[PDB]
Design an enzyme around this catalytic site. Sequence first.
Site, PDB file in Angstrom:
ATOM      1  N   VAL A  47       9.310 -32.501 123.887  1.00 30.79           N
ATOM      2  CA  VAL A  47       7.928 -32.935 123.944  1.00 30.79           C
ATOM      3  C   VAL A  47       7.702 -33.832 122.730  1.00 30.79           C
ATOM      4  CG1 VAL A  47       5.532 -32.217 123.756  1.00 30.79           C
ATOM      5  CG2 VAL A  47       7.112 -30.944 125.194  1.00 30.79           C
ATOM      6  N   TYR A  52      13.059 -31.761 118.516  1.00 26.80           N
ATOM      7  CA  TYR A  52      12.910 -30.386 118.110  1.00 26.80           C
ATOM      8  C   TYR A  52      11.881 -29.546 118.854  1.00 26.80           C
ATOM      9  CZ  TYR A  52      16.271 -31.829 114.662  1.00 26.80           C
ATOM     10  OH  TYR A  52      17.404 -32.313 114.049  1.00 26.80           O
ATOM     11  N   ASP A 180      19.446 -24.751 114.660  1.00 26.18           N
ATOM     12  CA  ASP A 180      18.124 -25.078 114.155  1.00 26.18           C
ATOM     13  C   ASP A 180      17.208 -23.880 113.955  1.00 26.18           C
ATOM     14  OD1 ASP A 180      15.948 -27.157 113.610  1.00 26.18           O
ATOM     15  OD2 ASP A 180      14.997 -25.952 115.198  1.00 26.18           O
ATOM     16  N   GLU A 205      20.974 -23.163 110.099  1.00 30.76           N
ATOM     17  CA  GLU A 205      19.989 -23.671 109.158  1.00 30.76           C
ATOM     18  C   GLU A 205      18.992 -22.562 108.862  1.00 30.76           C
ATOM     19  OE1 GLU A 205      16.488 -25.323 110.282  1.00 30.76           O
ATOM     20  OE2 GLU A 205      16.156 -26.598 108.526  1.00 30.76           O
ATOM     21  N   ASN A 209      12.187 -19.943 101.117  1.00 29.05           N
ATOM     22  CA  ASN A 209      11.632 -20.377  99.848  1.00 29.05           C
ATOM     23  C   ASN A 209      12.531 -20.045  98.670  1.00 29.05           C
ATOM     24  OD1 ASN A 209       9.094 -19.278 101.619  1.00 29.05           O
ATOM     25  ND2 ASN A 209       8.544 -21.154 100.518  1.00 29.05           N
ATOM     26  N   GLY A 277      29.413 -20.753  95.286  1.00 30.40           N
ATOM     27  CA  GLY A 277      30.061 -19.866  94.333  1.00 30.40           C
ATOM     28  C   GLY A 277      30.421 -18.459  94.783  1.00 30.40           C
ATOM     29  N   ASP A 291      15.074 -33.575 107.090  1.00 32.42           N
ATOM     30  CA  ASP A 291      13.822 -32.968 106.648  1.00 32.42           C
ATOM     31  C   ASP A 291      13.570 -33.201 105.167  1.00 32.42           C
ATOM     32  OD1 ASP A 291      13.455 -31.730 109.179  1.00 32.42           O
ATOM     33  OD2 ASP A 291      14.612 -29.982 108.509  1.00 32.42           O
ATOM     34  N   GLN A 296      10.694 -37.856 106.069  1.00 34.65           N
ATOM     35  CA  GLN A 296       9.880 -36.654 105.940  1.00 34.65           C
ATOM     36  C   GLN A 296       9.796 -36.305 104.444  1.00 34.65           C
ATOM     37  OE1 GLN A 296       9.743 -33.748 109.406  1.00 34.65           O
ATOM     38  NE2 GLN A 296      11.925 -34.256 109.408  1.00 34.65           N
ATOM     39  N   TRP A 402      38.615 -38.007  87.973  1.00 35.03           N
ATOM     40  CA  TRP A 402      39.973 -38.183  87.452  1.00 35.03           C
ATOM     41  C   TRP A 402      41.014 -37.523  88.350  1.00 35.03           C
ATOM     42  CZ3 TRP A 402      35.707 -37.389  84.718  1.00 35.03           C
ATOM     43  CH2 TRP A 402      35.501 -38.094  83.515  1.00 35.03           C
TER      44      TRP A 402
HETATM   45  C1  LIG Z   1      34.410 -44.290  83.129  1.00 35.15           C
HETATM   46  C2  LIG Z   1      32.968 -43.859  82.943  1.00 35.15           C
HETATM   47  O1  LIG Z   1      32.306 -43.862  84.233  1.00 35.15           O
HETATM   48  C3  LIG Z   1      30.921 -43.529  84.192  1.00 35.15           C
HETATM   49  O2  LIG Z   1      30.205 -44.413  83.377  1.00 35.15           O
HETATM   50  C4  LIG Z   1      29.392 -45.417  84.007  1.00 35.15           C
HETATM   51  C5  LIG Z   1      27.986 -45.352  83.402  1.00 35.15           C
HETATM   52  O3  LIG Z   1      27.382 -44.106  83.717  1.00 35.15           O
HETATM   53  C6  LIG Z   1      27.118 -46.501  83.923  1.00 35.15           C
HETATM   54  O4  LIG Z   1      25.856 -46.474  83.279  1.00 35.15           O
HETATM   55  C7  LIG Z   1      27.799 -47.848  83.654  1.00 35.15           C
HETATM   56  O5  LIG Z   1      27.803 -48.126  82.285  1.00 35.15           O
HETATM   57  C8  LIG Z   1      28.183 -49.485  81.906  1.00 35.15           C
HETATM   58  C9  LIG Z   1      26.903 -50.308  81.671  1.00 35.15           C
HETATM   59  O6  LIG Z   1      26.280 -50.565  82.920  1.00 35.15           O
HETATM   60  C10 LIG Z   1      27.188 -51.632  80.942  1.00 35.15           C
HETATM   61  O7  LIG Z   1      25.963 -52.258  80.580  1.00 35.15           O
HETATM   62  C11 LIG Z   1      28.012 -51.334  79.686  1.00 35.15           C
HETATM   63  O8  LIG Z   1      28.291 -52.498  78.984  1.00 35.15           O
HETATM   64  O9  LIG Z   1      29.249 -50.728  80.073  1.00 35.15           O
HETATM   65  C12 LIG Z   1      29.053 -49.415  80.635  1.00 35.15           C
HETATM   66  C13 LIG Z   1      30.427 -48.834  80.891  1.00 35.15           C
HETATM   67  O10 LIG Z   1      30.997 -49.366  82.077  1.00 35.15           O
HETATM   68  O11 LIG Z   1      29.110 -47.855  84.213  1.00 35.15           O
HETATM   69  C14 LIG Z   1      29.999 -46.807  83.753  1.00 35.15           C
HETATM   70  C15 LIG Z   1      31.274 -46.984  84.534  1.00 35.15           C
HETATM   71  O12 LIG Z   1      31.061 -46.661  85.902  1.00 35.15           O
HETATM   72  C16 LIG Z   1      30.776 -42.100  83.648  1.00 35.15           C
HETATM   73  O13 LIG Z   1      29.410 -41.728  83.602  1.00 35.15           O
HETATM   74  C17 LIG Z   1      31.398 -42.000  82.247  1.00 35.15           C
HETATM   75  O14 LIG Z   1      31.305 -40.656  81.780  1.00 35.15           O
HETATM   76  C18 LIG Z   1      32.874 -42.453  82.284  1.00 35.15           C
HETATM   77  N1  LIG Z   1      33.535 -42.434  80.983  1.00 35.15           N
HETATM   78  C19 LIG Z   1      34.631 -41.478  80.922  1.00 35.15           C
HETATM   79  C20 LIG Z   1      35.998 -41.945  81.382  1.00 35.15           C
HETATM   80  C21 LIG Z   1      37.019 -42.477  80.384  1.00 35.15           C
HETATM   81  C22 LIG Z   1      38.298 -43.084  80.939  1.00 35.15           C
HETATM   82  O15 LIG Z   1      38.069 -44.319  81.592  1.00 35.15           O
HETATM   83  C23 LIG Z   1      36.802 -42.390  78.868  1.00 35.15           C
HETATM   84  O16 LIG Z   1      36.969 -43.655  78.234  1.00 35.15           O
HETATM   85  C24 LIG Z   1      35.417 -41.882  78.536  1.00 35.15           C
HETATM   86  O17 LIG Z   1      35.465 -41.315  77.240  1.00 35.15           O
HETATM   87  C25 LIG Z   1      34.903 -40.842  79.552  1.00 35.15           C
HETATM   88  O18 LIG Z   1      33.704 -40.263  79.067  1.00 35.15           O
HETATM   89  C1  LIG Z   2      11.168 -28.419 108.824  1.00 36.82           C
HETATM   90  C2  LIG Z   2      11.720 -27.067 108.373  1.00 36.82           C
HETATM   91  O1  LIG Z   2      10.613 -26.177 108.088  1.00 36.82           O
HETATM   92  C3  LIG Z   2      10.977 -24.867 107.623  1.00 36.82           C
HETATM   93  O2  LIG Z   2      11.563 -24.900 106.354  1.00 36.82           O
HETATM   94  C4  LIG Z   2      10.692 -24.629 105.302  1.00 36.82           C
HETATM   95  C5  LIG Z   2      11.212 -23.401 104.550  1.00 36.82           C
HETATM   96  O3  LIG Z   2      11.113 -22.265 105.398  1.00 36.82           O
HETATM   97  C6  LIG Z   2      10.431 -23.164 103.254  1.00 36.82           C
HETATM   98  O4  LIG Z   2      11.071 -22.151 102.499  1.00 36.82           O
HETATM   99  C7  LIG Z   2      10.382 -24.453 102.431  1.00 36.82           C
HETATM  100  O5  LIG Z   2       9.590 -24.264 101.304  1.00 36.82           O
HETATM  101  O6  LIG Z   2       9.817 -25.514 103.210  1.00 36.82           O
HETATM  102  C8  LIG Z   2      10.635 -25.831 104.360  1.00 36.82           C
HETATM  103  C9  LIG Z   2      10.063 -27.074 105.003  1.00 36.82           C
HETATM  104  O7  LIG Z   2       8.841 -26.795 105.670  1.00 36.82           O
HETATM  105  C10 LIG Z   2      11.909 -24.162 108.640  1.00 36.82           C
HETATM  106  O8  LIG Z   2      12.359 -22.908 108.111  1.00 36.82           O
HETATM  107  C11 LIG Z   2      13.109 -25.065 108.973  1.00 36.82           C
HETATM  108  O9  LIG Z   2      13.891 -24.465 109.983  1.00 36.82           O
HETATM  109  C12 LIG Z   2      12.636 -26.445 109.451  1.00 36.82           C
HETATM  110  N1  LIG Z   2      13.725 -27.342 109.813  1.00 36.82           N
HETATM  111  C13 LIG Z   2      14.123 -27.397 111.218  1.00 36.82           C
HETATM  112  C14 LIG Z   2      13.120 -26.843 112.266  1.00 36.82           C
HETATM  113  C15 LIG Z   2      12.285 -27.817 113.082  1.00 36.82           C
HETATM  114  C16 LIG Z   2      11.464 -27.149 114.164  1.00 36.82           C
HETATM  115  O10 LIG Z   2      12.395 -26.999 115.216  1.00 36.82           O
HETATM  116  C17 LIG Z   2      12.277 -29.343 112.873  1.00 36.82           C
HETATM  117  O11 LIG Z   2      10.969 -29.881 112.662  1.00 36.82           O
HETATM  118  C18 LIG Z   2      13.180 -29.693 111.684  1.00 36.82           C
HETATM  119  O12 LIG Z   2      13.525 -31.065 111.740  1.00 36.82           O
HETATM  120  C19 LIG Z   2      14.456 -28.822 111.691  1.00 36.82           C
HETATM  121  O13 LIG Z   2      15.450 -29.389 110.848  1.00 36.82           O
END
Ligand SMILES: C=C1O[C@H](O[C@H]2[C@H](O)[C@@H](O)[C@@H](O[C@H]3[C@H](O)[C@@H](O)[C@H](O)O[C@@H]3CO)O[C@@H]2CO)[C@H](O)[C@@H](O)[C@@H]1N[C@H]1C=C(C=O)C(=O)[C@H](O)[C@H]1O
Ligand SMILES: C=C1O[C@H](O[C@H]2[C@H](O)[C@@H](O)[C@H](O)O[C@@H]2CO)[C@H](O)[C@@H](O)[C@@H]1N[C@H]1C=C(C=O)C(=O)[C@H](O)[C@H]1O
Length: 404
Positions: A47, A52, A180, A205, A209, A277, A291, A296, A402
């Site tokens: 409908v 849904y 659903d 699903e 809360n 976990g 949703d 939405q 890595w």
């Molecule tokens: C390899 C790194 O990858 C990730 O870093 C992102 C970063 O979050 C972005 O904000 C972006 O930063 C760039 C800026 O946009 C630019 O203006 C600046 O000049 O250069 C930086 C660096 O590129 O892009 C980088 C790269 O995607 C990630 O968050 C970061 O932790 C990571 N660094 C790690 C990896 C290494 C090995 O390559 C080590 O050298 C670092 O110590 C390690 O933390």
């Molecule tokens: C749209 C969802 O609504 C409900 O989820 C709520 C949780 O119960 C609540 O804890 C949280 O704070 O808010 C949520 C959003 O309102 C339903 O439990 C959940 O099943 C529902 N999602 C599916 C059900 C539908 C009705 O058939 C559809 O409208 C949705 O698109 C479905 O994915």
Amino acid sequence: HQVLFQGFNWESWKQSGGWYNMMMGKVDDIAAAGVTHVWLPPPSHSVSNEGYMPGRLYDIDASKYGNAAELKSLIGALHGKGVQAIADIVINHRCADYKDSRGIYCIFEGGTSDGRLDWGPHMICRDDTKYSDGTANLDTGADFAAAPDIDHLNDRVQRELKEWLLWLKSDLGFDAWRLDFARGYSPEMAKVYIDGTSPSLAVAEVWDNMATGGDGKPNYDQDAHRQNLVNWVDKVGGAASAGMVFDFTTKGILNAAVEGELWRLIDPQGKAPGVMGWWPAKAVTFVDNHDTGSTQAMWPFPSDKVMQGYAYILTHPGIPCIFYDHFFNWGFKDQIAALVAIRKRNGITATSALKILMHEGDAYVAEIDGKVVVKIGSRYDVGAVIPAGFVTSAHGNDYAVWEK
Ligand SMILES: C=C1O[C@H](O[C@H]2[C@H](O)[C@@H](O)[C@@H](O[C@H]3[C@H](O)[C@@H](O)[C@H](O)O[C@@H]3CO)O[C@@H]2CO)[C@H](O)[C@@H](O)[C@@H]1N[C@H]1C=C(C=O)C(=O)[C@H](O)[C@H]1O
Ligand SMILES: C=C1O[C@H](O[C@H]2[C@H](O)[C@@H](O)[C@H](O)O[C@@H]2CO)[C@H](O)[C@@H](O)[C@@H]1N[C@H]1C=C(C=O)C(=O)[C@H](O)[C@H]1O
Ligand SMILES: C=C1O[C@H](O[C@H]2[C@H](O)[C@@H](O)[C@H](O)O[C@@H]2CO)[C@H](O)[C@@H](O)[C@@H]1N[C@H]1C=C(C=O)C(=O)[C@H](O)[C@H]1O
Ligand SMILES: [Ca+2]
Ligand SMILES: [Ca+2]
Ligand SMILES: [Ca+2]
């Protein structure tokens, strides 16, 4: 290897020429990215436009998403690439096509010539007084306010839904289910349908809360939230059952965590804080769905950190689920594909071991199966935390991965 993909959003039914038809052109990109299962929308007459509020369940031709031939073509194409199809099963409630003598919409039509699914008010939970005739059993779960809730304790109901479900598999080719509003009926009732239809998987699903504090943020301790989900899985059949749940605990915690509160991503026992976990094999993790995200926007992941969400779920235990928009419309296609490739190439699965190396406000660093290290957070340098032998293989805004 297992990676899910939500193949639609809230606006999908509006697709020019039909959603499934457009999806044919997306099949190859989805499969090539390492996706194993695609979740498709409720396929029956509804409908409501999104599907849904199902009515004539066998009337697939009436769907806003496309007809039975178009759906068959899509699933056939997915299968042609080794990708399974998951159907969104909406059975907690149903809309009856006709009014009865009380002027109440409670006379159902299944969509076939005979009487299958041609139920009446006797199949509506007696406590859903808006529609029932008081003769049915009490609802086994929560009520969906906008439509008649179904009495899954009814013999014919179980029989006919199971028959319909088997048909979705045999006639359309569906492989698995997405249950659903699983909160709507008991896990016992969900067991009937899961056990009775042998889906490859059945992701429930159950959305409840999440406890929050005075400031609106979720409490650090969310054990009660994941315990509820774990309890659902136990009751549905546990390890033996094909049943599993979306990890809403991880979704709620992650939403908050990335806003510089990455210390939230570890419980006091040293484990991921969400269902991931405790029962990873049964945890389907995600960044957003139709949703929470899309139009939405009920609980959207911080828009500027979506890739941290994927760097997290795509490298971790639990079964990750990619959202359509994030893959094709946000410009993350190559980055997301690269993350799935690392997961797959390293044999990471839902049960891989997780060793968290750092969990500070602006830096979360974890090691998976001793083969992959991942980092998210605004803190740039985490080099000192990186184990010897690892080298970057993928990185982006506030995330890096890595490999040995
Ligand atoms: C390899 C790194 O990858 C990730 O870093 C992102 C970063 O979050 C972005 O904000 C972006 O930063 C760039 C800026 O946009 C630019 O203006 C600046 O000049 O250069 C930086 C660096 O590129 O892009 C980088 C790269 O995607 C990630 O968050 C970061 O932790 C990571 N660094 C790690 C990896 C290494 C090995 O390559 C080590 O050298 C670092 O110590 C390690 O933390
Ligand atoms: C749209 C969802 O609504 C409900 O989820 C709520 C949780 O119960 C609540 O804890 C949280 O704070 O808010 C949520 C959003 O309102 C339903 O439990 C959940 O099943 C529902 N999602 C599916 C059900 C539908 C009705 O058939 C559809 O409208 C949705 O698109 C479905 O994915
Ligand atoms: C793997 C178990 O997960 C759940 O147990 C969690 C508890 O609910 C929680 O309170 C406790 O602190 O943490 C547990 C996770 O470590 C399920 O309740 C439990 O049934 C489940 N164990 C089953 C699954 C198996 C395969 O993973 C079997 O080998 C076990 O024997 C099952 O009992
Ligand atoms: Ca009929
Ligand atoms: Ca109802
Ligand atoms: Ca119900």
